[PDB]
Every structure is written in structure tokens, then in C-alpha cells.
Paper text:
From these experiments we obtained crystals of γA4EC3–6 and γB2EC3–6, which diffracted to sufficient resolution for crystal structure determination. The resolution of the final refined structures was 3.0/4.3/2.85 Å for γA4EC3–6 and 2.3 Å for γB2EC3–6. The two structures are similar overall (RMSD of 3.02 Å over 405 Cα’s), although γA4EC3–6 shows a more pronounced EC4–EC5 bend angle (32.6° for γA4 vs. 18.6° for γB2). These are the first Pcdh structures containing EC6, which displays the classic beta sandwich fold, but with a large insertion between the A and A’ strands. However the γB2EC3–6 crystal structure also did not reveal any interactions with clear biological relevance. Since γB2EC3–6 forms a weak cis dimer in solution (80.1 μM), this was unexpected. The monomeric arrangement in the crystal is likely an artifact of crystallization, perhaps due to the low pH of the crystallization condition (pH 6.5). Furthermore, O-mannosylation is observed at EC6 G-strand residues 624, 626, and 628 (γB2 numbering) of both the γB2 and γA4 structures—on the opposite molecular face to the mutations that disrupt cell surface delivery.
By contrast, in vertebrates the clustered protocadherins (Pcdhs) provide analogous cell-surface diversity, but in this case generated through stochastic alternative promoter choice. Biophysical measurements with domain-deleted proteins showed that Pcdhs also interact in cis, through a membrane-proximal dimer interface involving extracellular cadherin domain 6 (EC6) and potentially EC5. The specificity-determining cell-cell recognition interface of Pcdhs involves domains EC1–4, as shown experimentally through mutagenesis analysis and suggested by mutation correlation analysis.
Numbering used by the authors: 209 to 239, 245 to 637
Write the structure that this text describes.
């Protein structure tokens, strides 16, 4: 009868061997034309291996896969031309190769991630799978870059992605975090996943005024409701946290009369004069405005504004001396004829309610019955004789004088001076 060299053969195959790979040849001995056949084998044996009925060579006819089957049991029956038969078994062991990529499973991503999250806030939960065995299935993760995110390993194949750095939406509003996982096989395989992080806003920025303080000039006699300035503050926060409202909180004026002077539009920051300013009553006043955001809690800043009321020429000069008659004339009839040049006949005394050039007075002769007999001090308003009185000079003299300010246009007052020389 036929007989195999032994009952049980053992071979190992790498899962990556191509179809048609030589597994083993088994032969029985007539000591002839013997037939070989599988018997009592699994269905997958018939589907993976080919047994030469005449030669007894065994080859694969399809691809292997350690993840699907780690071993095969092959029973071969040898039949000579007679009825007798013999059997042997071949236990085929499959070897694991690194042919399965690691995969990364990310859940519970903190979306969005508040910018005030404490150190150690759990952003995401990470889990790794690897269908291979042993080292080929041993996966480890790490984060690329140094943007402030660290992987904490709670147990094997489980990670927590945590912050280790204070966040700031105003500096970095979005993050792309790449987590890479690699196995420890030969050669190693790796995969990666990109976690996108949206940093949500917190009201952590107070409004800031565009200027450290405000110096405003407003011409006197302005209409009420005249826009005199516009404050502006900025706030990098989002939405309600960056919405600014302006207001007036303090002033060196009477608190009950503050609204009667100035206001500010709460949305535009335009500052209005609520009344016609009068430089002669008040030259300047101080003001403290506030910019406030609409966050919880609110943030604010304070800025000082000074308003300078500008002088206009709204007052004409007025003569205080000499006293004038209803016709605007004054009489000086005791002027001695022997008066030496420089004799002070009289002095026009005028005042002006304004300031600066608007109240800088100058005195002019408009009409003279004898030009050059009398002089008129341009700035003093002193009326003096300029030359010795002559024999052909009239006893009665008349001057029409004007006191003007230095405004534009110049306002003035006039007076007629009857100067009458007395005979000795
Ligand atoms: C985080 O990453 C995403 C996605 O980026 C994509 O994948 C990466 C691995 C890289 O290969 C990138 O090059 C790739 O875009 C960024 O999203 C943004 O996606 C759009 C989609 O096309 C990118 O292109 C724009 O698409 C519009 C669509 O109409 C075009 O009109 C634009 O002209 C533009 O091309 C966009 O570039 C991309 N932004 C990037 C790469 O910065 C996401 O922005 C990124 N986050 C950060 C903070 O960088
Ligand atoms: C800006 O100033 C505001 C004014 O509030 C009042 O005035 C001052 C003089 C203090 O006495 C203050 O306590 C009063 O309530 C404040 O309300 C506000 O907090 C200030 N903001 C900043 C950023 O300083
Ligand atoms: C192909 O090669 C293998 C090498 O071991 C043999 O075992 C087989 O029988 C066939 O000759
Ligand atoms: C997975 O990603 C790593 C990145 O380090 C590569 O080196 C590797 O070859 C595979 O592409
Ligand atoms: C209101 O309007 C005046 C001009 O009329 C500006 O000067 C002011 O700043 C505010 O915008
Ligand atoms: C005044 O200017 C600030 C910027 O400094 C703006 O935020 C504001 O809207 C106004 O234009
Ligand atoms: C004084 O001067 C002004 C102009 O300077 C006149 O308008 C006024 O009537 C007076 O003569
Ligand atoms: C001075 O003179 C002018 C010109 O006559 C008058 O208008 C004024 O009232 C004052 O008498
Ligand atoms: C001063 O007074 C005389 C009249 O006495 C006027 O003629 C002159 O214009 C000014 O008013
Ligand atoms: Ca496989
Ligand atoms: Ca494998
Ligand atoms: Ca693997
Ligand atoms: Ca911030
Ligand atoms: Ca913010
Ligand atoms: Ca804010
Ligand atoms: Ca005035
Ligand atoms: Ca004035
Ligand atoms: Ca004046």
C-alpha cells in the first residue's frame, strides 16, 4: 500500500506570498500511478490551495490574509490503482505581515474652543486601531508642531488632546492640528488626521480711544446742535463684546447744567454743542467721556476732552470818556492859545468786551477842521496840539474821531470833539 514519509507535515507561509507559491509536495510509496485528493478539509482549503492529483505538489491559488485566517489544515489522501489508501496532514501556519495601516478615531472635539479655556482643557478624545498583530499592530501617536496642544495617554490606545498654553482669539482665531499615528512594524505604516479648532470670543478687551485726550476748538455764537467733535474707540472683541457706546460722565461745569452745554451721540461718538457758547462768559470747560462695550461683564475706558470757546468780534468798542451829547459831540472850550506842542486837550477812553485783536483799540481822525493842528495817539487816544497855534487858525476847531478794534471786519465807535481856543 502507499505510505507517506510521515503523518503530519508543518509549513509556514508569509501572508504576502503571491498565488502559485510552492507550499509543499507530499508523495506516497507503492513499495506506481497514485492519485492525491483533499478530504475532510475546510471549504477555504479548496478555495486557497491547489493539489496536483498526480504529482502531489501543493501550491496556493489565491491570496493569503493573516487577518482572515491564521492557519490551514490540509488532509491529503493517496490512492494507488488498488482500493487501499493512505492519508497525511499538512498544518499550514500563516505569518503576520505589516499590511494594515493604523487609523485614528477622534471624538468629542471642543467646538468651538473658548479662548479663556484653562490649561489642561480636554479638546478631543483620540483612539487608535490597527488590524495587525504584535508590533505591527502597536500604534503610538504624537502631535505635529508646537502651537500649544499636548497628547495625554490615559490608557493604551487612548489619548486626550489637551491645551498646555493660554489661548487668544485676537492673536490666533483658528487652528489646524495634525495628529499622526504610526505602527512599530518593519517597515512601519502611518496615518494622520487634521483637527480644526475654532477659538470662540470672550470679552477680554476694553475699548481704547483713538486719542489719549481731546482738545476741541469751537467758535463762539455757534448754533445750538452744532457737532463740535467726534470721539472714537476701538475694541477687537466680537459682536456684543466689541460694540461701543459713548457717554459723558464728568465735567467741571455744574452737573445740573451739563446737558445744557454738550452731549454725545451714544453710537456715533459725535459731540454736540447744546447751546450757543459766549466767549465773554466762559472761555473753556473740561469734559470726561467714556467708551463702554456690551459684553458680560462690560469693559470701558475714560478720556478727557477740553473745549476751548473761541473769541469772535461780536462786541463793538464803546466810548466811556468824554461824555458825549445825544449828537455824539463833546465840548472843550478852555484851550489856551499859548499852548506849547504836546498840550493834552483831552483823551478818548474806550473799552471793548472782546479779547486779543478783537479788542485791540486804535484811534483815528476821520475829519479835522485843520489837519495837523491836533494829533491823535494811535493807541492812546490822547488828543494833543501838534504845532503852535497860528494867527490864521480858527478859534473853533472840530475833530471827528473813530476808535476801532483790530477785528475783521473792524467794529468802531465815533465821537465829535469840538475844540475851542480861548482868547487871552
Ligand atoms: C485648515 O485647513 C483647511 C483645509 O485645508 C485643506 O487641506 C489641507 C490639508 C491643505 O492641503 C490645504 O491646502 C487645503 O485647502 C483650510 O480651509 C480652507 O479651504 C479652502 C477650500 O478650497 C481653501 O481654498 C479656498 O477655497 C475658496 C473656495 O471658493 C477659494 O475661492 C479660495 O481662493 C481658496 O483657494 C483655503 O485655502 C483653505 N485655507 C487654508 C488652507 O488656510 C483652513 O483655512 C485651514 N485653517 C487655517 C487656520 O489655516
Ligand atoms: C471710568 O470712569 C467712570 C466714572 O465713574 C465715576 O467717576 C470716577 C471719578 C470714580 O469716582 C468712579 O468710581 C465713579 O463711579 C467709572 O465708572 C469707570 O469704571 C472708569 N473706567 C475705567 C476703565 O477707569
Ligand atoms: C516548491 O518549492 C518548495 C520549497 O520548499 C517545495 O517544498 C515544494 O514542494 C515545491 O517544490
Ligand atoms: C505615515 O506618516 C509618516 C509621517 O512621519 C511617514 O513618515 C510614513 O511614511 C507614513 O506616510
Ligand atoms: C459732527 O459734524 C461736524 C461737522 O459738522 C464734525 O466736525 C464733527 O466731528 C462731527 O462729525
Ligand atoms: C473711530 O476710529 C476707531 C478706530 O481707531 C473705529 O473703531 C471707530 O469705528 C471710529 O471709526
Ligand atoms: C468806525 O469804523 C467802522 C469800520 O472800521 C465803520 O463801519 C463805523 O461806522 C465807524 O465809522
Ligand atoms: C460818530 O460819528 C458817526 C458818523 O457820523 C455816527 O454814525 C455815530 O453815531 C457817532 O456820532
Ligand atoms: C459827532 O457830532 C457831530 C454833530 O455835532 C456829527 O456831525 C458827527 O458826524 C459826529 O456824530
Ligand atoms: Ca492582511
Ligand atoms: Ca497583517
Ligand atoms: Ca500595522
Ligand atoms: Ca483674547
Ligand atoms: Ca476677545
Ligand atoms: Ca470688548
Ligand atoms: Ca460773545
Ligand atoms: Ca467776543
Ligand atoms: Ca471788539
Amino acid at each position: 500500500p502507499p505510505m507517506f514519509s510521515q503523518d503530519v507535515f508543518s509549513v509556514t507561509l508569509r501572508e504576502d506570498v503571491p498565488p502559485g507559491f510552492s507550499v509543499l509536495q507530499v508523495t506516497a510509496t507503492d513499495q506506481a500511478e497514485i492519485t492525491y485528493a483533499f478530504h475532510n478539509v475546510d471549504e477555504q482549503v479548496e478555495r486557497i490551495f491547489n493539489l496536483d492529483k498526480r504529482t502531489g505538489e501543493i501550491t496556493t491559488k489565491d491570496n493569503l490574509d493573516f487577518e482572515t485566517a491564521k492557519s490551514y489544515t490540509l488532509n491529503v489522501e493517496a490512492k494507488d490503482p488498488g482500493d487501499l489508501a493512505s492519508h497525511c496532514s499538512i498544518q499550514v501556519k500563516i505569518l503576520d505581515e505589516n499590511d494594515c495601516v493604523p487609523e485614528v478615531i477622534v471624538t468629542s472635539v471642543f467646538t468651538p474652543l473658548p479662548e479663556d479655556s484653562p490649561l489642561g482643557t480636554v479638546i478631543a478624545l483620540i483612539k487608535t486601531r490597527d488590524r495587525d498583530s504584535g508590533e505591527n499592530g502597536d500604534v503610538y501617536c504624537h502631535v505635529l508642531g508646537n502651537e500649544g496642544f499636548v497628547l495625554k495617554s490615559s490608557s493604551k490606545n487612548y489619548y486626550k488632546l489637551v491645551t498646555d498654553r493660554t489661548l487668544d482669539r485676537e492673536a490666533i482665531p483658528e487652528y489646524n492640528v495634525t495628529i499622526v499615528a504610526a505602527d512599530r512594524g518593519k517597515p512601519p505604516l502611518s496615518s494622520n488626521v487634521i483637527i480644526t479648532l475654532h477659538i470662540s470670543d470672550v470679552n477680554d478687551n476694553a475699548p481704547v480711544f483713538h486719542q489719549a485726550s481731546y482738545l476741541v476748538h469751537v467758535a463762539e455764537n455757534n448754533p445750538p446742535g452744532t457737532s463740535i467733535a467726534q470721539v472714537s474707540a476701538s475694541d477687537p472683541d466680537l459682536g456684543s463684546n466689541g460694540l461701543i457706546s459713548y457717554s459723558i460722565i464728568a465735567s467741571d461745569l455744574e452737573p445740573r447744567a451739563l446737558s445744557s452745554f454738550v452731549s454725545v451721540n451714544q453710537d456715533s461718538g459725535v459731540v454736540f454743542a447744546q447751546r450757543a457758547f459766549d466767549h465773554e462768559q466762559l472761555r473753556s470747560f473740561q469734559l470726561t467721556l467714556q467708551a463702554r462695550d456690551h459684553g458680560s461683564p462690560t469693559l470701558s475706558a475714560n478720556v478727557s476732552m477740553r473745549v476751548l470757546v473761541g473769541d469772535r468780534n461780536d462786541n463793538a468798542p464803546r466810548v466811556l470818556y468824554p461824555t458825549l451829547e445825544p449828537d455824539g459831540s463833546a465840548l472843550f472850550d478852555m484851550v489856551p492859545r499859548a499852548a506849547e506842542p504836546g498840550y493834552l486837550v483831552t483823551k478818548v477812553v474806550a473799552v471793548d468786551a472782546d479779547s486779543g485783536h478783537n479788542a485791540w483799540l486804535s484811534y483815528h481822525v476821520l475829519q479835522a477842521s485843520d489837519p495837523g493842528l491836533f494829533s491823535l495817539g494811535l493807541r492812546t487816544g490822547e488828543v494833543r496840539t501838534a504845532r503852535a497855534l497860528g494867527d490864521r487858525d480858527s478859534a473853533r476847531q472840530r475833530l471827528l474821531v473813530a476808535v476801532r478794534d483790530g477785528g475783521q471786519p473792524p467794529l468802531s465807535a465815533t465821537a465829535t470833539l469840538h475844540l475851542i481856543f480861548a482868547d487871552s
